[PDB]
DNA sequence: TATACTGTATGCGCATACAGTA
DNA sequence: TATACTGTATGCGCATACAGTA
């Protein structure tokens, strides 16, 4: 049930249409967009991509294209798991770079930069993150947030926290995989 | 130009048809919909939101019906400009209200370490619910003579006290009877982003 | 002429089936 | 049979104009 490459344009397309001109496409917009000198390209490229099930078709209507697949999400606790768990309609443009999901902090590691046990993280999914930036590493299969501090074999994770030690990583006996760059952060207790 | 009442109805269907179906609807639609047993009605009815402007009526193409319709931070406010003082809010970023709880209503840029000790920091996008019953205890952003200040309330009828979550920060004493005070919220929340 | 419509009427607008050709 | 189409037809689905009646 994966989508072609011309497959994908058209409902790419329908989306544009739709977020654009409040509206759907019809067959003949969807040709003369995309290039086809027949309709019925558009129809059975619509066709298929009912059965893929990724739109629904209107019998009779004009414009009768409904997309069905349809903020950033968090993950809860474990960087990425399907498909848990909450969905929030935030602004990713609104973080440096672009956030790509929500991680919910456990601890007080980076209390003294103000990331409080039970925050919801803003992160970057990235490999490439340098030295002295704020991570999210996952430890044999244990994600965890930290300032991060390489040295070839040698990582080093520190806290923002003088009650908190340094956790030394070396991968040569232990598995470690970059989830994302922390960008930023979001707090919603609803404490009294 | 003001809607007459059968004009307020039908914005409102399309408002909905477009909300429960992904399209605008047709003059039969809508015409079907409200009683009409003439799509004219619709037609009519339509050519007159398309003159009040709030709508766009689309020539030839079918259900060519189109509508024309989040948070703000407040700047760093000069005195005698109110809470809100216009123009200060500097931008607004399209945020979810119904993530914090109570909703949000704006957001507020902190500054300072005064509420080091939980996670609010220097240049945190403070949200804030706009609202003068806060109780004790919880924090407040309140605005001693036009100086918009966030701590936590203690208020003691006449004698109200703002109390820091730092350890270097002493409470900020207040006496009505000598000083204006309005709680211009309650802060809900906090988002981080530079 | 301006709202609020019922009724009738054209006719492009559009969805959609039945052919090809790669 | 499943993509990707070009081409042709068949008709309703639709916007809209032209009267009427309150």
Do not use: C
Not at 78 to 94: M, T
Not at 121 to 150: F, S, Y
């Amino acid at each position: 049930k994966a989508l072609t490459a011309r497959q994908q344009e058209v409902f790419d397309l329908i989306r544009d249409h739709i977020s654009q001109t409040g509206m759907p496409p019809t067959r003949a917009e969807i040709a003369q967009r995309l290039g086809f000198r027949s309709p019925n390209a558009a129809e059975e490229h619509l066709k298929a991509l009912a059965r893929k099930g990724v739109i629904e078709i209107v019998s009779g209507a004009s414009r009768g294209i409904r997309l069905l697949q349809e903020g950033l999400p968090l993950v809860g606790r474990v960087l990425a798991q399907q498909h848990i768990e909450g969905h929030y309609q935030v602004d990713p443009s609104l973080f440096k770079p672009n956030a790509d999901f929500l991680l919910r902090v456990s601890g007080m590691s980076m209390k003294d930069i103000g990331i409080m046990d039970g925050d919801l993280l803003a992160v970057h999914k990235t490999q490439d993150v340098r030295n002295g930036q704020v991570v999210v590493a996952r430890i044999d299969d244990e994600v965890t947030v930290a300032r991060l501090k390489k040295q070839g074999n040698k990582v080093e994770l520190l806290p923002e926290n003088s009650e908190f030690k340094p956790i030394v990583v070396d991968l040569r006996q232990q598995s470690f995989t970059i989830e994302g760059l922390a960008v930023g952060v979001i707090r919603n207790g609803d404490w009294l």
